[PDB]
Amino acid sequence: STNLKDILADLIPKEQARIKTFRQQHGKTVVGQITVDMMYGGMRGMKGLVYETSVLDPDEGIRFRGFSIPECQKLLPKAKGGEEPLPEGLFWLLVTGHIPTEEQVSWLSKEWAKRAALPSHVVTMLDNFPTNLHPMSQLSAAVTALNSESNFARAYAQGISRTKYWELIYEDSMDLIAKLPCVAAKIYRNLYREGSGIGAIDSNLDWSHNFTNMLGYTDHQFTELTRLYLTIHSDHEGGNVSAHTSHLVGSALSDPYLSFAAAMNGLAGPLHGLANQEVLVWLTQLQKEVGKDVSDEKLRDYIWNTLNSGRVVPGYGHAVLRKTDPRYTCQREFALKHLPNDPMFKLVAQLYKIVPNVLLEQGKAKNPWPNVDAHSGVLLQYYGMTEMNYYTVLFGVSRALGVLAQLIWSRALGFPLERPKSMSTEGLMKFVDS
Amino acid sequence: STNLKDILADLIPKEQARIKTFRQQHGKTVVGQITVDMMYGGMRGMKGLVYETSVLDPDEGIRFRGFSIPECQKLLPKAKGGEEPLPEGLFWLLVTGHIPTEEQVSWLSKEWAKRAALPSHVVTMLDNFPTNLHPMSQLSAAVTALNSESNFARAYAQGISRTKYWELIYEDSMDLIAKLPCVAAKIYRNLYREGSGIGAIDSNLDWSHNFTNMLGYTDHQFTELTRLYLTIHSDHEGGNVSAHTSHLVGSALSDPYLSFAAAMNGLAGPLHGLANQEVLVWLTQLQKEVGKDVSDEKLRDYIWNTLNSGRVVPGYGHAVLRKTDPRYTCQREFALKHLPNDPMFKLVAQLYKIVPNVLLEQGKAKNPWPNVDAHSGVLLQYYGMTEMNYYTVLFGVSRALGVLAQLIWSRALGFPLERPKSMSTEGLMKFVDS
Ligand SMILES: CC(C)(COP(=O)(O)OP(=O)(O)OC[C@H]1O[C@@H](n2cnc3c(N)ncnc32)[C@H](O)[C@@H]1OP(=O)(O)O)[C@@H](O)C(=O)NCCC(=O)NCCS
Ligand SMILES: O=C([O-])CC(=O)C(=O)O
After folding, report:
1. Would you call A327 helix, strand, or coil by DSSP?
2. What is the CATH number of domain A275-382?
3. Is residue B399 annotated as involved in ligand binding?
4. Which of A31, A242, A244, A249 would you mutate first to test chain B, the one with the most B CBs within 10 A?
5. Rounded alpha-carbon distances, angstroms, from residue A240 to A51, A237, A248, A264
6. DSSP at A238
7. Cβ contacts of A248 on chain B, cutoff 8 Å
8. Distance between CA atoms of B55 and B63, rounded to whole angstroms?
9. CA-CA 20 to 30 A from A365: which of A2, A100, A150, A229?
């Protein structure tokens, strides 16, 4: 009823059967071709893996178990007094395929509060890290070190039945998600608040609120922003580096801690998790150079100059998209409600009215619309979260929700080791001649 | 000259132009098909990536830049007064595609000696890790923490040209390889020798010898074993989880420290890097039940009984190999030379005589021949290294050579982000129906 674990136990046989049926009908059906170019091009365009939790709708943006962002905003439980979807709800959705009730979300909040304690060896290690070790490296190292807590790793050693893997994956994933705000808050405080304590978990608060408390923030609007942010960055299909990495490392039966840590190493890559930062830097430098009271015309002028030097307009354009990412719109509405007077926000709203100015005036992009990362920095900075080197840690805490919901299902469904075949250039040149 | 970095700088343009033409002429050529089953089955049999350093014939086993293990055992430099190939030469081969001279190997030993220092925060973290944190977790966490020393990460943030990425990746890889024995030996001694010190690096020893010194082994044969072990586990194509994880995380421009630590979390998975231990636990059990000097007859009994009960013979089979693993034969040759009368070895050899026979007599094999992991445990245990949980740390140190060699090249050749397309079961169903 409230116990997600039993609800999941009842859902798994149905999904197994549905998959078995489809594979028995179509296992040998060709869904795509592999070219030499795909091999050299990072598997671009190649349908490579099954990932159940989210799908990119090319006319509506990301869908979470079939629900668009606007639909999650309407349907997911809010905190009492709140307008923003609780990440607990999102996770319940990703795991079950169902919108939770308020009571299920409350049960989930309390489950994560109960599991939130850090072992001292991780507290120690975090407390010993130097300030020149990047927050993401601290996050990954700590999560790795938490695997001393792994239920799954120990059960596997004892010879547990395959039919039970998902249960221990579930437990470890619940433990991890509950711990992550503690880890992330310890890093923030050690780096930017002189090593002060994170304080206590409150059994009766949602996950986002316990998080913003441990960070040392008090602002209701910042907790609402955090609720939204953690919901919308939660999952984006399986093919992004962080999801894929978790998937790949999980497929070797590495526990959730190791899988998630590896994922965070992928997220730390400049081409995956640093878009938030690049935008904000660019906005800062812009606003200082043209002033707050900049007119459309002069701002338009600036953008043209930027692009006349083959410099990118950060956060406009994407890999796979076709319209304003609802993940942006979502933050825009937030800002228009809560900080309409803020200068940097007013610039970001001004860049939205003007920048689309055709990336088809080129032909060498694919989209003139802003992605999620064009809006996130200004909101964080507005609320006093100015340490841009930490922004990817927030993305990482969000992304836990998606990749762990999927990891539970991958083991439930008995997905095997991921092991594609590689070839060398020499090998391939020979292969194409034969 | 002897400077590998200048030699590599001269090779790269050649290979760039050769790939550019090949892709121009044959980029659209189809090399394979994707089926529904491949998507559900972990990309099994799917040509997914280009990986230049090594190629596995299902038939004759791994080739390092076109050279088999037997060929490398003869051609690669040895230590003065030794018979086993030095890992240094293997790395040189993987990087350049050329067999090194003695002098080049000597230069590379000294480069690694000089780069071997750990920063104080990493020494501290290792000394503080508790005894219930697995060696592989310690190794991954430590390597992640070393990324404070990344030249690549700092250059990237300053806006270095893409033409130069390979240089900083090379520098960081050389630093990581140099440090890994220090990290590995600290772990070993902290866990298994009550925290005693690793001592010092000798500037004129090879990498493997410095390593065994720091582990506390002084036996010349154990150094020779280590030299061979680190050479032969170095690389096994791009599709294995450790190499693939490194490739995938690397493709987001994460530095070698992050890429490698992610790879280790993959290696730590039971389906990837725990086979050695699983073999050795099975053999030990076997040699209790059926006694010390068992007869072929009684041995074949146990093997039949194992198969009958639906139980697996660890150490036999593979995801692509379909014949005796040359990495096994290697370890056999070493055993026949150095420890023929060892009882546990006699069993391993006995099992090679029996197990392949009965495995086909059954016919549910696909690969009835032993892989590397069938043979390594009894060699390690022979020399006093009985801490099974540590064995995968040795594999990891070896594998750095292959994956970092390839990572230099991936960046040199400008390989993009790895980003396959995922699909849900529902989405795939709809895709196929359309
Ligand atoms: C390596 C391994 C996992 C590859 O399996 P795979 O490619 O998925 O499977 P195969 O093509 O061999 O499958 C044929 C059947 O023979 C079985 N099989 C393979 N090797 C076997 C062995 N040594 N003993 C018993 N059964 C074996 C498989 O499990 C499979 O059984 P099933 O079809 O009834 O489910 C498998 O051979 C194995 O279990 N090896 C033992 C562990 C080991 O040594 N691993 C180290 C390599 S990474
Ligand atoms: O995948 C994308 O297009 C955006 C992204 O990096 C993520 O959310 O993972």
Report:
1. helix
2. 1.10.230.10
3. yes
4. A249
5. 11, 7, 12, 12
6. S
7. 241, 244-245, 248, 266
8. 5
9. A229
CB B64 within 8 A of CB B54: yes
Retrieve residue A50's tokens: 């099954």
Active-site residues of B, by number, are 272, 318, 373
Q: What are residue A48's phi and psi, to 5 degrees?
A: -115, -25
Cα angle value B172/B177/B181 (rounded, 5°): 140
- 3-class secondary structure, A34: strand
Query: Are A52 and B425 an interchain contact pair (Cβ–Cβ within 8 Å)?
Result: yes
Residue A163 CA to residue A413 CA, distance in Å, equals: 9
Q: Is A109 exposed, middle or buried (0-12, 13-18, 19+ CB in 10 A)?
A: buried
Q: Which atom of ligand 2 is nearest to the CA of A275?
A: 6
Tell me the two tokens of residue A353: 């009215």
Cβ neighbours, 10 Å, residue B117? 14
Q: Which of residues 189-208 of B touch A (CB under 8 A)?
A: none
The domain limits of chain A are: 275-382
CB atoms within 10 A of CB A323: 13
User: What gap in Å lies between CA B129 and CA B116, rounded to an integer?
Assistant: 21
Say yes or no: B429 contacts chain A, CB-CB below 8 A. yes
HEC secondary structure over chain B: CCCHHHHHHHHHHHHHHHHHHHHHHHCCCEEEEEEHHHHHCCCCCCEEEECCCEEEECCCEEEECCECHHHHHHHCCECCCCCCECHHHHHHHHHHCCCCCHHHHHHHHHHHHHCCCCCHHHHHHHHHCCCCCCHHHHHHHHHHHHHHHCHHHHHHHCCCCHHHHHHHHHHHHHHHHHHHHHHHHHHHHHHHCCCCCCCCCCCCCCHHHHHHHHHCCCCHHHHHHHHHHHHHCCCCCCCCHHHHHHHHHHHCCCCHHHHHHHHHHHHCCHHHHCHHHHHHHHHHHHHHHCCCCCCHHHHHHHHHHHHHCCCCCCCECCCCCCCCCHHHHHHHHHHHHHCCCCHHHHHHHHHHHHHHHHHHHHCCCCCCCECCHHHHHHHHHHCCCCCHHHHHHHHHHHHHHHHHHHHHHHHHCCCCCCCCEEECHHHHHHHHHC
A55's enclosing H/E stretch is strand A54-57
**Experimental technique:** X-ray
Give the C-alpha separation, B406 to B394, whole Å: 19
Chain B: residue whose CA lies nearest to A133 = B148
Q: Check residue A100 and report its DSSP letter.
A: P
> Does any CB of chain B come closer than 8 Å to the CB of residue A153?
yes
Contact B43 A49 (CB under 8 A): yes
Do B242 and B61 meet the contact criterion of CB atoms below 8 Å apart? Answer: no
CATH of domain B285-382: 1.10.230.10
Residue ranges of B 204-263 with Cβ closer than 8 A to chain A: 237-241, 243-245, 248-249, 251-254, 258-259, 261-262
Resolution (A): 1.8
C-alpha of B400 from chain center: 7
Which residues form the pocket of ligand 1, taking CB atoms under 6 Å from any ligand atom?
B 275, 312-319, 364-367, 371, 373
Asked if residues B383 and B212 have their Cβ atoms less than 8 Å apart, the reply is: no
Q: Which residue has the tokens 């938030």?
A: A276
Q: Identify the nearest ligand to the CA of A245 by its number.
A: 2
Is A272 one of the annotated active-site residues of the chain? yes
Residue in the structure block whose two tokens are 């690397």: B250
CA–CA gap between residue A14 and residue B378 (Å, rounded): 45
User: HSE-up of A16 (CA within 13 Å, CB side)?
Assistant: 13
Distance CA B267, CA B285 (A): 25
- Annotated binding-site ranges of A for oxaloacetate: 327, 399, 419
Residue B127 near residue B241 (C-beta atoms within 8 A): no
Rounded to 5°, angle at Cα B294 from B292 and B298: 145
